[PDB]
Amino acid sequence: VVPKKKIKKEQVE
Amino acid sequence: SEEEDKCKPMSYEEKRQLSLDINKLPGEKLGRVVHIIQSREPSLKNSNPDEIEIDFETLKPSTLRELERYVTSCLRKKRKPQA
C-alpha cells in the first residue's frame, strides 16, 4: 500500500 | 462511459511514483493536486486545501492520472520548480 500523502504545507522536495 | 476505459488504471509502483512526483510539486502548484483530488473526490471535500491528505487508494484512476500528468507539466517540463 502506498502511504497516505501528508500534505501539511511545505512538502516540496 | 468511455471515461472509464479511456483512463488507464494506476498500479502500485505508479501510485508510488505519483506520490513522489506530487512531493516534487511546490506549495503553490501542489494546491492544485489537493484541488483536483478534493474536486474529483468530493468524499474528501471536508479536507482543507492546505492540509490535504492525498489518499492514492481512494483516488480514482482519473484523478491519479490527472495528478500524475499534472505534475509532469511542472516536473517533466521544468527541472526543480521550487528553485
CSV table of N, CA and C in Angstrom, one decimal:
chain,number,residue,atom,x,y,z
A,1,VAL,N,0.8,-1.2,0.0
A,1,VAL,CA,0.0,0.0,0.0
A,1,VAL,C,0.9,1.3,0.0
A,2,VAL,N,0.5,2.2,-0.9
A,2,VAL,CA,1.2,3.5,-0.9
A,2,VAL,C,0.8,4.3,0.3
A,3,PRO,N,1.8,4.8,1.1
A,3,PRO,CA,1.5,5.7,2.3
A,3,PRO,C,0.7,6.9,1.9
A,4,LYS,N,-0.3,7.2,2.7
A,4,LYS,CA,-1.2,8.4,2.5
A,4,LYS,C,-0.3,9.6,2.6
A,5,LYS,N,-0.4,10.5,1.5
A,5,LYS,CA,0.4,11.6,1.4
A,5,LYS,C,0.0,12.7,2.4
A,6,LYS,N,0.8,13.0,3.3
A,6,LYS,CA,0.6,14.0,4.3
A,6,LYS,C,1.0,15.4,3.8
A,7,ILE,N,0.0,16.2,3.4
A,7,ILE,CA,0.3,17.5,2.8
A,7,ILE,C,-0.1,18.6,3.8
A,8,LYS,N,0.8,18.8,4.7
A,8,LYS,CA,0.5,19.8,5.8
A,8,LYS,C,1.3,21.1,5.6
A,9,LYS,N,1.3,21.6,4.3
A,9,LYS,CA,2.1,22.8,3.9
A,9,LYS,C,3.6,22.6,3.9
A,10,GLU,N,4.2,23.1,2.9
A,10,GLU,CA,5.7,22.9,2.7
A,10,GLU,C,6.1,21.5,2.7
A,11,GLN,N,5.7,20.8,1.6
A,11,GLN,CA,6.1,19.4,1.5
A,11,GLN,C,6.8,19.1,0.2
A,12,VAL,N,7.3,20.2,-0.4
A,12,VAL,CA,8.0,20.1,-1.7
A,12,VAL,C,9.5,19.7,-1.5
A,13,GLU,N,9.9,18.7,-2.3
A,13,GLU,CA,11.3,18.2,-2.3
A,13,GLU,C,11.7,18.1,-3.7
B,1,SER,N,-19.4,7.1,-20.7
B,1,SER,CA,-18.9,5.8,-20.1
B,1,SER,C,-17.5,5.4,-20.6
B,2,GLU,N,-17.1,6.0,-21.7
B,2,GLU,CA,-15.8,5.8,-22.3
B,2,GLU,C,-14.7,6.3,-21.3
B,3,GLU,N,-15.1,7.2,-20.4
B,3,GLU,CA,-14.2,7.8,-19.5
B,3,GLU,C,-13.6,6.8,-18.6
B,4,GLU,N,-14.3,5.7,-18.4
B,4,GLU,CA,-13.9,4.6,-17.5
B,4,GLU,C,-12.8,3.7,-18.2
B,5,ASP,N,-12.9,3.7,-19.5
B,5,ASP,CA,-11.9,2.9,-20.3
B,5,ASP,C,-10.8,3.7,-20.8
B,6,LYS,N,-11.1,5.0,-21.1
B,6,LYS,CA,-10.1,5.9,-21.6
B,6,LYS,C,-9.0,6.1,-20.5
B,7,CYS,N,-9.4,6.1,-19.3
B,7,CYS,CA,-8.4,6.2,-18.2
B,7,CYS,C,-7.8,4.8,-17.9
B,8,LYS,N,-6.5,4.8,-17.9
B,8,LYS,CA,-5.8,3.5,-17.6
B,8,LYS,C,-5.5,3.4,-16.1
B,9,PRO,N,-5.6,2.2,-15.5
B,9,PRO,CA,-5.5,2.0,-14.1
B,9,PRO,C,-4.1,2.2,-13.6
B,10,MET,N,-4.0,2.9,-12.5
B,10,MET,CA,-2.7,3.3,-11.9
B,10,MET,C,-2.2,2.2,-11.0
B,11,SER,N,-1.1,1.5,-11.3
B,11,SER,CA,-0.6,0.4,-10.4
B,11,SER,C,0.1,0.9,-9.1
B,12,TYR,N,0.5,0.0,-8.3
B,12,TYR,CA,1.1,0.3,-7.0
B,12,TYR,C,2.4,1.1,-7.2
B,13,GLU,N,3.3,0.6,-8.1
B,13,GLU,CA,4.5,1.2,-8.5
B,13,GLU,C,4.3,2.6,-9.0
B,14,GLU,N,3.2,2.8,-9.6
B,14,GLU,CA,2.9,4.1,-10.2
B,14,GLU,C,2.3,5.0,-9.2
B,15,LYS,N,1.4,4.6,-8.4
B,15,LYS,CA,0.9,5.4,-7.3
B,15,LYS,C,2.0,5.9,-6.4
B,16,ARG,N,3.0,5.1,-6.2
B,16,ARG,CA,4.2,5.4,-5.5
B,16,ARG,C,5.0,6.6,-6.2
B,17,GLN,N,5.3,6.4,-7.5
B,17,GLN,CA,5.9,7.4,-8.3
B,17,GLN,C,5.1,8.7,-8.3
B,18,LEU,N,3.8,8.5,-8.4
B,18,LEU,CA,2.9,9.6,-8.3
B,18,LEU,C,3.0,10.4,-7.0
B,19,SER,N,3.0,9.7,-5.9
B,19,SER,CA,3.2,10.3,-4.6
B,19,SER,C,4.5,11.0,-4.5
B,20,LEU,N,5.5,10.5,-5.3
B,20,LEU,CA,6.8,11.1,-5.3
B,20,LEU,C,6.9,12.3,-6.2
B,21,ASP,N,6.1,12.3,-7.3
B,21,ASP,CA,6.1,13.4,-8.2
B,21,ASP,C,5.2,14.5,-7.7
B,22,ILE,N,4.2,14.2,-6.9
B,22,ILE,CA,3.4,15.1,-6.1
B,22,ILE,C,4.3,15.8,-5.1
B,23,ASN,N,5.2,15.0,-4.5
B,23,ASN,CA,6.1,15.5,-3.5
B,23,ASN,C,7.1,16.5,-4.1
B,24,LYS,N,7.2,16.5,-5.4
B,24,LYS,CA,8.1,17.4,-6.2
B,24,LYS,C,7.5,18.7,-6.4
B,25,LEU,N,6.1,18.8,-6.3
B,25,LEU,CA,5.4,20.0,-6.6
B,25,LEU,C,5.6,21.0,-5.5
B,26,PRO,N,5.9,22.3,-5.8
B,26,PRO,CA,6.0,23.4,-4.9
B,26,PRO,C,4.6,23.7,-4.2
B,27,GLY,N,4.7,24.4,-3.1
B,27,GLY,CA,3.5,24.7,-2.3
B,27,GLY,C,2.3,25.2,-3.1
B,28,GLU,N,2.6,26.1,-4.0
B,28,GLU,CA,1.5,26.7,-4.8
B,28,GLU,C,1.0,25.8,-5.9
B,29,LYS,N,1.9,25.0,-6.5
B,29,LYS,CA,1.4,24.1,-7.5
B,29,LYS,C,0.8,22.8,-6.9
B,30,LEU,N,1.2,22.5,-5.7
B,30,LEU,CA,0.6,21.3,-5.1
B,30,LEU,C,-0.8,21.5,-4.5
B,31,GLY,N,-1.1,22.8,-4.4
B,31,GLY,CA,-2.5,23.1,-4.0
B,31,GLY,C,-3.5,22.7,-5.1
B,32,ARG,N,-3.0,22.5,-6.4
B,32,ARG,CA,-3.8,22.0,-7.5
B,32,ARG,C,-4.1,20.6,-7.3
B,33,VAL,N,-3.2,19.8,-6.8
B,33,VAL,CA,-3.4,18.3,-6.6
B,33,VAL,C,-4.5,18.2,-5.6
B,34,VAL,N,-4.3,18.9,-4.4
B,34,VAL,CA,-5.4,18.9,-3.4
B,34,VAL,C,-6.7,19.3,-4.0
B,35,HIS,N,-6.7,20.2,-5.0
B,35,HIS,CA,-7.9,20.7,-5.6
B,35,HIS,C,-8.5,19.7,-6.5
B,36,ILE,N,-7.6,19.1,-7.4
B,36,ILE,CA,-8.1,18.0,-8.3
B,36,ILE,C,-8.7,16.9,-7.5
B,37,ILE,N,-8.0,16.5,-6.5
B,37,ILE,CA,-8.4,15.5,-5.6
B,37,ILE,C,-9.7,15.8,-4.9
B,38,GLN,N,-9.7,16.9,-4.1
B,38,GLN,CA,-11.0,17.3,-3.4
B,38,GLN,C,-12.2,17.4,-4.4
B,39,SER,N,-11.9,17.9,-5.6
B,39,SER,CA,-13.0,18.1,-6.6
B,39,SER,C,-13.4,16.8,-7.2
B,40,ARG,N,-12.5,16.0,-7.6
B,40,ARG,CA,-12.8,14.7,-8.2
B,40,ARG,C,-13.2,13.7,-7.1
B,41,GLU,N,-12.7,13.9,-5.9
B,41,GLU,CA,-13.1,13.1,-4.8
B,41,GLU,C,-13.9,13.9,-3.8
B,42,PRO,N,-15.2,14.2,-4.0
B,42,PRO,CA,-16.0,15.0,-3.1
B,42,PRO,C,-16.2,14.4,-1.8
B,43,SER,N,-15.7,13.2,-1.6
B,43,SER,CA,-15.8,12.5,-0.3
B,43,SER,C,-14.8,13.0,0.6
B,44,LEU,N,-13.8,13.7,0.1
B,44,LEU,CA,-12.8,14.3,1.0
B,44,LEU,C,-12.8,15.8,0.9
B,45,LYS,N,-13.9,16.4,0.5
B,45,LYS,CA,-14.1,17.8,0.4
B,45,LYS,C,-14.1,18.5,1.8
B,46,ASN,N,-14.2,17.6,2.8
B,46,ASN,CA,-14.1,18.1,4.2
B,46,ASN,C,-12.7,18.5,4.6
B,47,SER,N,-11.8,18.0,3.7
B,47,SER,CA,-10.4,18.3,4.0
B,47,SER,C,-10.0,19.7,3.4
B,48,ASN,N,-9.1,20.3,4.1
B,48,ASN,CA,-8.7,21.7,3.7
B,48,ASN,C,-7.6,21.6,2.7
B,49,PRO,N,-7.6,22.6,1.7
B,49,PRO,CA,-6.7,22.6,0.6
B,49,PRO,C,-5.2,22.8,0.9
B,50,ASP,N,-5.0,23.3,2.1
B,50,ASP,CA,-3.6,23.5,2.6
B,50,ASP,C,-3.2,22.4,3.6
B,51,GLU,N,-4.1,21.5,3.8
B,51,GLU,CA,-3.9,20.4,4.8
B,51,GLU,C,-4.4,19.1,4.2
B,52,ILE,N,-4.4,19.0,2.9
B,52,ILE,CA,-5.0,17.8,2.2
B,52,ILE,C,-4.2,16.6,2.5
B,53,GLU,N,-4.9,15.4,2.5
B,53,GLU,CA,-4.3,14.1,2.6
B,53,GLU,C,-4.6,13.4,1.3
B,54,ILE,N,-3.6,13.4,0.4
B,54,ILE,CA,-3.8,12.7,-0.9
B,54,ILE,C,-3.8,11.2,-0.7
B,55,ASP,N,-5.0,10.6,-0.7
B,55,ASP,CA,-5.1,9.2,-0.5
B,55,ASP,C,-5.2,8.4,-1.8
B,56,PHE,N,-4.0,7.9,-2.3
B,56,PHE,CA,-3.9,7.4,-3.6
B,56,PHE,C,-4.7,6.1,-3.8
B,57,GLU,N,-5.2,5.5,-2.6
B,57,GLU,CA,-6.0,4.3,-2.7
B,57,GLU,C,-7.5,4.7,-2.9
B,58,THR,N,-7.9,5.9,-2.4
B,58,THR,CA,-9.3,6.3,-2.7
B,58,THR,C,-9.4,7.1,-4.0
B,59,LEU,N,-8.2,7.7,-4.4
B,59,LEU,CA,-8.2,8.5,-5.6
B,59,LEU,C,-8.5,7.6,-6.8
B,60,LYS,N,-9.5,8.0,-7.6
B,60,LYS,CA,-9.9,7.3,-8.8
B,60,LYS,C,-8.7,7.4,-9.8
B,61,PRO,N,-8.6,6.4,-10.7
B,61,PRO,CA,-7.6,6.3,-11.7
B,61,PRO,C,-7.6,7.7,-12.5
B,62,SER,N,-8.8,8.2,-12.7
B,62,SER,CA,-8.9,9.5,-13.4
B,62,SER,C,-8.1,10.6,-12.6
B,63,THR,N,-8.4,10.7,-11.3
B,63,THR,CA,-7.7,11.7,-10.5
B,63,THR,C,-6.2,11.4,-10.6
B,64,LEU,N,-5.8,10.2,-10.3
B,64,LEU,CA,-4.4,9.8,-10.2
B,64,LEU,C,-3.7,10.1,-11.5
B,65,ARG,N,-4.3,9.8,-12.7
B,65,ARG,CA,-3.7,10.1,-14.0
B,65,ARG,C,-3.6,11.6,-14.2
B,66,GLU,N,-4.6,12.3,-13.6
B,66,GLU,CA,-4.6,13.8,-13.7
B,66,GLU,C,-3.5,14.3,-12.8
B,67,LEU,N,-3.4,13.9,-11.5
B,67,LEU,CA,-2.4,14.3,-10.6
B,67,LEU,C,-1.0,14.1,-11.3
B,68,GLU,N,-0.8,12.8,-11.7
B,68,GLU,CA,0.4,12.4,-12.4
B,68,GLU,C,0.7,13.3,-13.6
B,69,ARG,N,-0.2,13.4,-14.5
B,69,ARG,CA,0.0,14.2,-15.8
B,69,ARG,C,0.2,15.7,-15.4
B,70,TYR,N,-0.5,16.1,-14.4
B,70,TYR,CA,-0.4,17.5,-13.9
B,70,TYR,C,1.0,17.8,-13.5
B,71,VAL,N,1.5,17.0,-12.6
B,71,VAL,CA,2.9,17.2,-12.0
B,71,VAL,C,3.9,17.2,-13.2
B,72,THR,N,3.6,16.4,-14.2
B,72,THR,CA,4.6,16.2,-15.3
B,72,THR,C,4.7,17.5,-16.1
B,73,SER,N,3.7,18.3,-16.1
B,73,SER,CA,3.7,19.6,-16.7
B,73,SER,C,4.7,20.5,-16.0
B,74,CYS,N,4.8,20.3,-14.7
B,74,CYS,CA,5.7,21.1,-13.8
B,74,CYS,C,7.0,20.5,-13.6
B,75,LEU,N,7.1,19.1,-13.7
B,75,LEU,CA,8.3,18.4,-13.4
B,75,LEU,C,9.0,18.0,-14.6
B,76,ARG,N,8.3,17.3,-15.6
B,76,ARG,CA,9.0,16.8,-16.7
B,76,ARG,C,9.1,17.8,-17.8
B,77,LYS,N,8.7,19.0,-17.5
B,77,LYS,CA,8.8,20.2,-18.4
B,77,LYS,C,9.6,21.3,-17.8
B,78,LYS,N,10.0,21.1,-16.5
B,78,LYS,CA,10.8,22.1,-15.8
B,78,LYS,C,11.5,21.4,-14.6
B,79,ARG,N,12.8,21.6,-14.6
B,79,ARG,CA,13.6,21.0,-13.6
B,79,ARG,C,13.6,21.8,-12.3
B,80,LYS,N,13.2,21.2,-11.2
B,80,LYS,CA,13.2,21.8,-9.9
B,80,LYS,C,12.4,23.1,-9.9
B,81,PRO,N,11.0,23.0,-9.8
B,81,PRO,CA,10.1,24.2,-9.9
B,81,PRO,C,10.1,25.0,-8.7
B,82,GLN,N,10.8,24.6,-7.6
B,82,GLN,CA,10.9,25.3,-6.4
B,82,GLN,C,12.2,26.0,-6.3
B,83,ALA,N,13.0,25.9,-7.3
B,83,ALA,CA,14.3,26.6,-7.3
B,83,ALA,C,14.2,28.0,-7.9
